RNA sequence: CCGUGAGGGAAAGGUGAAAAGAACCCCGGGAGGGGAGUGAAAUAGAGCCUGAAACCGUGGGCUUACAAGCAGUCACGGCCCCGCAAGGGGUUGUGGCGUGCCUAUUGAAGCAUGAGCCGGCGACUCACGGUCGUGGGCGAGCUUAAGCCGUUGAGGCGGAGGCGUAGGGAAACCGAGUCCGAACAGGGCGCAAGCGGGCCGCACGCGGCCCGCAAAGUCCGCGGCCGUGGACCCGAAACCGGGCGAGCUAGCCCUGGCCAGGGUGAAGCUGGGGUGAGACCCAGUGGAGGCCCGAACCGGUGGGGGAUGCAAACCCCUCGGAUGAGCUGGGGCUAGGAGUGAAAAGCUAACCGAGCCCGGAGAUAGCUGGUUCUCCCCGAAAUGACUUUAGGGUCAGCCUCAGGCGCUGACUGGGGCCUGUAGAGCACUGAUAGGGCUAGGGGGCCCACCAGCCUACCAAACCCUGUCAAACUCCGAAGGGUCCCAGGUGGAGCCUGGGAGUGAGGGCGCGAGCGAUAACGUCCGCGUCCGAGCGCGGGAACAACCGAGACCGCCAGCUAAGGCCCC
RNA sequence: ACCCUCGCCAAGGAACUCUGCAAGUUGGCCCCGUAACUUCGGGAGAAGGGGUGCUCCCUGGGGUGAUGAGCCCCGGGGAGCCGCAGUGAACAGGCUCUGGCGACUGUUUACCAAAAACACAGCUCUCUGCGAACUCGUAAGAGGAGGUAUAGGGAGCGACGCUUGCCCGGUGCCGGAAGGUCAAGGGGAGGGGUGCAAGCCCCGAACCGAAGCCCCGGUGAACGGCGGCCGUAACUAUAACGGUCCUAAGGUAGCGAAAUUCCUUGUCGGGUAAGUUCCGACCUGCACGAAAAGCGUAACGACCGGAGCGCUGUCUCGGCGAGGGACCCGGUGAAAUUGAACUGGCCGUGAAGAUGCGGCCUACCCGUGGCAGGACGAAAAGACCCCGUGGAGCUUUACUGCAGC
RNA sequence: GUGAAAUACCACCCUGGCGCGGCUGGGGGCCUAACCCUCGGAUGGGGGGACAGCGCUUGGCGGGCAGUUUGACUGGGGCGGUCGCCUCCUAAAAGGUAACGGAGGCGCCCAAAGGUCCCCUCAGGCGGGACGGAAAUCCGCCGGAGAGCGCAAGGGUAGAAGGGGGCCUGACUGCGAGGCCUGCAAGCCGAGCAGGGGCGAAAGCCGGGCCUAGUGAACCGGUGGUCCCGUGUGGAAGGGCCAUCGAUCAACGGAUAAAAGUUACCCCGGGGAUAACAGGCUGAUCUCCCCCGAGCGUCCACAGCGGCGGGGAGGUUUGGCACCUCGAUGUCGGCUCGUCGCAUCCUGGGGCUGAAGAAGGUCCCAAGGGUUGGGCUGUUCGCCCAUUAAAGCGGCACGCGAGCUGGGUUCAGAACGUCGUGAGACAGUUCGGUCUCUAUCCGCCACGGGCGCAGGAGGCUUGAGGGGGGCUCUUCCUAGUACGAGAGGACCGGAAGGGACGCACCUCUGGUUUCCCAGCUGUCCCUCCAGGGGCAUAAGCUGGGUAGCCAUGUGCGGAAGGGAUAACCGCUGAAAGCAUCUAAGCGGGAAGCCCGCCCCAAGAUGAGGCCUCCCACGGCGUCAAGCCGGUAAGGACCCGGGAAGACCACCCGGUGGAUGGGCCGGGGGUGUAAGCGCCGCGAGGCGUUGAGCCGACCGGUCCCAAUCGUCCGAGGUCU
RNA sequence: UCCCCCGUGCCCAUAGCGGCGUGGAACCACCCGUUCCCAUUCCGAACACGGAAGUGAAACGCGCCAGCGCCGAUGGUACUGGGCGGGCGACCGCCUGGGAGAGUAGGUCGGUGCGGGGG
């Protein structure tokens, strides 16, 4: 029988997964309120017809379609062009 | 029958209508038989109706001493037996193929569990509630309970009462509304039920009778599941109550008995010495003692033997005590958290860390085991979250059934983005070898403070050449995710409800961790098989490797993997 | 064959083995003669020897008679005889030296432990003033005890000898009229509910209210604690000597690799040809120590160790003999176990150890006496281990109660 | 003047103390009459005495007792660690994703670090700069973000979320379309409407904070409001609703308001879901060999060695894993009995040597056979003693407990040290402690029975194929010679002895010999003396002792010899005009291999061979047995026996006979019988006398017994 | 329509940085002042106001260059959906789709709408 004293650790704790990311991709029809993106920082700037919540939480406020737009060094966006 | 006792507690029924129960003869000591006789029957002949199976025999048919096996099965052949025949029955000589049943498991022929064999007993029920479903009755309603009257396998009556017809509010309360609110803002519960439709009074009107069974419910029957009950059956170690036990053992009380023979020779006495008397020294006597040796007796030291024993503690040899804290008969007392204990938790009626019996009692058992007829359709799980949870559970995932919805499913084509792995690359964060240049610092020529000069040492920052990274990224695929439009009629999908089981997984491939890039290792990810395909072919044999999804039959055909010299 | 119980054995003589386990040796009686040590009783059966039959002769005591003979009972001296052998058979200690542990005789785990365990005389502490304390019991009552401090109860140690240090901080026990806190109850400033009111109901601050704990002193043959760390003497080492502290204080004597020593077969010495044991020492005591006593001690022990002598079948190393079985016949006639069996070897393979798969090898059918490697042989639903929100016994400054005070 | 502060006088009061008095409490003392105890029985006398006892109630102490609690995870369990939340990675470019994987944080804080309006832009690099480090604050360029943002990390960010200033409190109330996330309930984003506000000219923005941790369901209660309910009525008490409070319920989905240990005195239910043994897988560790050649070896890498490092094999170590076995796979050491491997301790062959010889070293070939006795410890192992040719290393469930032992270890007792308050405990010690007559199958050793072997018999045989056995030392002669300065000291060949072992044997030596002989004791008996018998073991004791069986005793054995080979050494010889053992062909060469030697053996169904015997159909089916009863050669049965033997078998006899028993002779053992005579008082001693008795052995002799008989068994299938 | 300038957006480096031109007629800026609205942590620097002598110096606008920055092929690899194989293993190969990053050739000192003033 050999079980010499067994060492120990500690750094064995992690955090809960937050399921962040883009929740609605361009072309998708969305009602007002539908929280499109749900990032942490400003990865995606609020576009026309879009609203930013406490946590930069992007959400549409107009019943229409979705669509992004890369402005280069101006940061990406995500406006919901109205179903006109 | 068992136990001292409380108490436990069996087994065992059948001649025949009628004893008519077998006179008598024969073998025999008898038993038992053979005749005779009774009877419808005696293989109804006496523990006798019927009398199965295991088991034991006698006779016959086939067949066996060079073969080897989960005992069979498929194929021919021989012998025997039926029938006219075709055909069939029994046996088994060769050949081919073949890893018991149950259980439990990731996995069993398994050298894991259970079973000697046969027969008989042996486990998912019942009551009342609940929830679905279903066969009926009546339905803006339905229905009685106790009890009464009747029957004597006759039903009636009985509206107390219960559900249902209004939802809301914590409530007062209001009401198709209501609750929060100041609010005709909002919002949470709520409601908004006709008719597929024959007929027909026979208004150019459908009334409304009718209808499914609803608006819509109830009642009764049946079935599934749930709750409370022992709630599928068997099983604890234990807990508690009332009793029975000291004829075993422990301790004390009373009253009686037993201890061959020897050995040793305490104190005392007496005598002789002794001295001034004494002490004291000698003998002698004496007969003390948890004294000695050793039978009885009481012990149980070592060894052997015994080990389904002579024996549930024995036998043999050898040992301890043996006038003592000794041994022993009879009569008595103390007992279950109690007694007793020269103290081992010993002993308390052959298992005492808490006696035995009966009772609570069918204790509880998230554990183990077992769970009995046939066929047909579908068919899992071994994951996640939480759990005094981790071999148990609740919800979800996956299975199934009923009803509803009807192209929405998996998969695929075309669009649009979402992303930072592979790879690569240093621009960031760090790591990097050498070289250049160059703050310093050893230190060096030193004209000595004013700098200075040199240095195959140390050495920043910075540039050049070479690289490194899961927690680096200037960059970045393949793919993957999702939405839209299209294909796609599948034991596809979606919605509502009834029944689950599963929450130990395993091997292989690939992508990571751990490990020591060891493990038939371990932990996740996708996939796939096994599981449940220990069904079939290949791989010598072999759950998961290659082939391939077994409804049944065929003395037909083409193939798969793998093969094509013989086996 | 083998097993039991018994007999003998050449040469050796413990080389056997955990161990002289077993067996043998020795064994009665008489006479010589016996060591250390000692509590002067012992150790004494210490050891170590010698004698032991029978015949004849002589002779002394006693008991009974009678003082005599007989008959009994103890002796003393002489000669001689025969065996391998004279307690001629049976009953019948092997001895010694040295340690440990208990004093001694004794008691105990009925059925694996007889002991260094219990007990024990003796020592100390403590309670009890007698309706004693304590024990049983609800109570009455009873034991204590028809006892009374030279008694009882409880506790530890355990003859005897020399002794039994240091620390009272904490726990316990004894004593304690300062103080802290604390129950019922008392007391009621003040406040409340209702009544038209008198009222009737309540709440409630000061303050007064027991043991208890805290506190203060004592107490060790009360529970207990006695670790360390620095400095220091004519090499070196050591430290009589000083200092230090979270605690209260830091091991006095005596013992010591011990029933205690991890390192360890410590290191010296002894005994042996050779010694992890043993004996005597040293002291680095992992982790002795004074009454859960320290250190000794004659005597005692079916206790445990180590050595010698003796003698052996223990062994080298077996042999033969005997009897009771085993074997065969007649009689009688069990058992655990058992899925069924038509039950072989090797390499493999397989849930990792197959008579049963594969390939090969071997192999006529059926018994009888033997052996014990396999049938993961039998027996017992592993006593170890883990699991179960299983169970019991026991402990305490775990919780919560209760008796008792 | 001193002091912090001033004193004559005047007061209001405070501190503490003493008196006399109300309020409330304590503790004594005396009394007797309740209660208690006592006196030769007492309506009474003593003693205690309102205490004690006893009732109700307060608080206390309280393992003496009772009921219980003492978590989970976990590469077994325990010990250690951990348990909720946040960041990054692992995570395989959506989301999610595990491990006792890798690395860090949280259990707060801010009234300004909040709302809004208006301004401002950093860090560093290089210059130049009073104290000024290498960053204080300045000035000038250059600098898109590397600074800053309360704290971890990440994301984000100057077109501000950063830095400053002004008013402010939206860190609102009533709501809340629509979503993210999700088992449950929780978490999260939030436009928009209403009420009443803040800042801005206005557009507008404000329902805390750049963002992601800073947290806790329910239950039970507290405090404000509510006016909702309030037990006949009214009011109250008490609830409800709204708001808010008390959680290291941190084991962080939270069992009770309330909880630790121990068991070797232990018990049940389960598990090979899970540890200890053995096996299995693996091979880090272990053992072994190989590659490289620093560098040692006077010189020289490789005689012998081998730095740093590298590649392997084995599966005997210590482990890892947790795969069969927990309705049981007995565990260390010894004994017994073997058997295998070779990585060889000895012995046999051989290469190189830093090999003169002798003795070594090293490597290659080679297990055929060997591989000692003791002291110590339970030991394995080791250390010693004395030897040896050597005192090999491993495997077989660390071989072997239905084979033995039980000394070590693991049950109950007891003690030491030590840990614990304790009960108890300790890979610490110490003494003690029940290891189960029966073998069914396989396997193994032996012995039979049946049938077969294609006529039946009685003999003798061949040997396919098995088994046994294989050892080694010393001395002498070659020759004190080759070799060697010397000391020492061989090969090859040839002898004689040993040791262990094996088979057989009993002449000898030495055992045993259970009644062969003698001697002896006690007792009972026959028959009194004498002479005898039983018993004192299953021999009473003692001394002897044939046959048989035996070792300590005796004789033999290992071979010799032939053949093929290992390493190794060559001949001839190309490819490659040389060289080369190789490619073709040929040799030499081991205790090893084959055969030789001893033993078994034709169930060698492949059933063999040789010699000799007896042979016929006689009655009867499918006409050579497919058939019956006598037969034949022969064979059993039965009997007498046996150095044969458990039984069976095998061998020898059976009256034509020496088989056993007896009798006779001889061996052989006892060691002078009885009786009688002589001497002695007697025990005894002479003599007759090597007498008597007398198993098995070597033989004679029909005296007794193997009387007499019976039953099987050919008639022999095919070209 | 066409050049120049002034405001504004889009594209977000081939849209810039840095050198070298040049421009003021107009617009713009610098300036002249700062009594007044308004100001600075202190400065009219910056905001702000009233102006108009001088100027293009600054700043800005518009050209020029490739050196830094940036952009960046084509080929060929890497890697990889899917399919099929090899090695004891560490790993690796063929088929079929997709297909980088670096590197090289080379590209660039912008393009462009709406409204104003002016030739
Ligand atoms: Mg917001
Ligand atoms: Mg009885
Ligand atoms: Mg008749
Ligand atoms: Mg009948
Ligand atoms: Mg009848
Ligand atoms: Mg019958
Ligand atoms: Mg054959
Ligand atoms: Mg045959
Ligand atoms: Mg099972
Ligand atoms: Mg399963
Ligand atoms: Mg089996
Ligand atoms: Mg089985
Ligand atoms: Mg089981
Ligand atoms: Mg079963
Ligand atoms: Mg049955
Ligand atoms: Mg049955
Ligand atoms: Mg019902
Ligand atoms: Mg039951
Ligand atoms: Mg009772
Ligand atoms: Mg009694
Ligand atoms: Mg005595
Ligand atoms: Mg008597
Ligand atoms: Mg005995
Ligand atoms: Mg015995
Ligand atoms: Mg015995
Ligand atoms: Mg036995
Ligand atoms: Mg005695
Ligand atoms: Mg009891
Ligand atoms: Mg009872
Ligand atoms: Mg008692
Ligand atoms: Mg006793
Ligand atoms: Mg007791
Ligand atoms: Mg008993
Ligand atoms: Mg109990
Ligand atoms: Mg009950
Ligand atoms: Mg039960
Ligand atoms: Mg049950
Ligand atoms: Mg359950
Ligand atoms: Mg199906
Ligand atoms: Mg359907
Ligand atoms: Mg479609
Ligand atoms: Mg698509
Ligand atoms: Mg990479
Ligand atoms: Mg389906
Ligand atoms: Mg699981
Ligand atoms: Mg698992
Ligand atoms: Mg699991
Ligand atoms: Mg696995
Ligand atoms: Mg693996
Ligand atoms: Mg499947
Ligand atoms: Mg399969
Ligand atoms: Mg199978
Ligand atoms: Mg196959
Ligand atoms: Mg099918
Ligand atoms: Mg074909
Ligand atoms: Mg002898
Ligand atoms: Mg002798
Ligand atoms: Mg010895
Ligand atoms: Mg020995
Ligand atoms: Mg003895
Ligand atoms: Mg005599
Ligand atoms: Mg007399
Ligand atoms: Mg005697
Ligand atoms: Mg004696
Ligand atoms: Mg004796
Ligand atoms: Mg004693
Ligand atoms: Mg004694
Ligand atoms: Mg006993
Ligand atoms: Mg004793
Ligand atoms: Mg005993
Ligand atoms: Mg009382
Ligand atoms: Mg009395
Ligand atoms: Mg004591
Ligand atoms: Mg003793
Ligand atoms: Mg095998
Ligand atoms: Mg088979
Ligand atoms: Mg047999
Ligand atoms: Mg046996
Ligand atoms: Mg066995
Ligand atoms: Mg009186
Ligand atoms: Mg009185
Ligand atoms: Mg009185
Ligand atoms: Mg009183
Ligand atoms: Mg208790
Ligand atoms: Mg992801
Ligand atoms: Mg992915
Ligand atoms: Mg939700
Ligand atoms: Mg009221
Ligand atoms: Mg192994
Ligand atoms: Mg079993
Ligand atoms: Mg070799
Ligand atoms: Mg030589
Ligand atoms: Mg065995
Ligand atoms: Mg033992
Ligand atoms: Mg023993
Ligand atoms: Mg003993
Ligand atoms: Mg042969
Ligand atoms: Mg053969
Ligand atoms: Mg002889
Ligand atoms: Mg002899
Ligand atoms: Mg002799
Ligand atoms: Mg007699
Ligand atoms: Mg003889
Ligand atoms: Mg040549
Ligand atoms: Mg040759
Ligand atoms: Mg030759
Ligand atoms: Mg044969
Ligand atoms: Mg033959
Ligand atoms: Mg023949
Ligand atoms: Mg004869
Ligand atoms: Mg004769
Ligand atoms: Mg003679
Ligand atoms: Mg003779």
Swiss-Prot record:
Which InterPro entries does the record match to this protein?
Answer: Ribosomal_bL27, Ribosomal_bL27_CS
Signal sequence region: none
Is Secreted included in the keywords of this UniProt record? no
Q: Name one GO biological process term.
A: translation
* UniProt GO molecular function: structural constituent of ribosome
Q: Which domain of life is it from?
A: Bacteria
The record's listing under PROSITE patterns reads: RIBOSOMAL_L27 (PS00831)
Q: Which UniProt keywords apply?
A: Ribonucleoprotein, Ribosomal protein
Known Pfam families for this protein? Ribosomal_L27
Q: Where is this region: Disordered?
A: 1-20
Instruction: Pull one GO CC term from this UniProt entry.
Output: cytosolic large ribosomal subunit
Q: Which HAMAP family match?
A: Ribosomal_bL27 (MF_00539)
Q: How does it assemble?
A: Part of the 50S ribosomal subunit.
- Give the family from UniProt: Belongs to the bacterial ribosomal protein bL27 family.
Q: What does this protein do?
A: Found on the solvent side of the large subunit.
Name assigned to this protein: Large ribosomal subunit protein bL27
């Amino acid at each position: 029988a050999h079980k010499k004293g067994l060492g120990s650790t500690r750094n064995g704790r992690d955090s809960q997964a937050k399921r962040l990311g883009v929740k609605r991709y361009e072309g998708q029809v969305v009602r007002a309120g539908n929280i499109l993106v749900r990032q942490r920082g400003t990865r995606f700037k609020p576009g026309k017809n879009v609203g930013m919540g406490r946590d930069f939480t992007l959400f549409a406020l107009v019943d229409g379609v979705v669509e992004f737009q890369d402005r280069g060094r101006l940061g990406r966006y995500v406006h919901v062009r109205p179903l006109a």
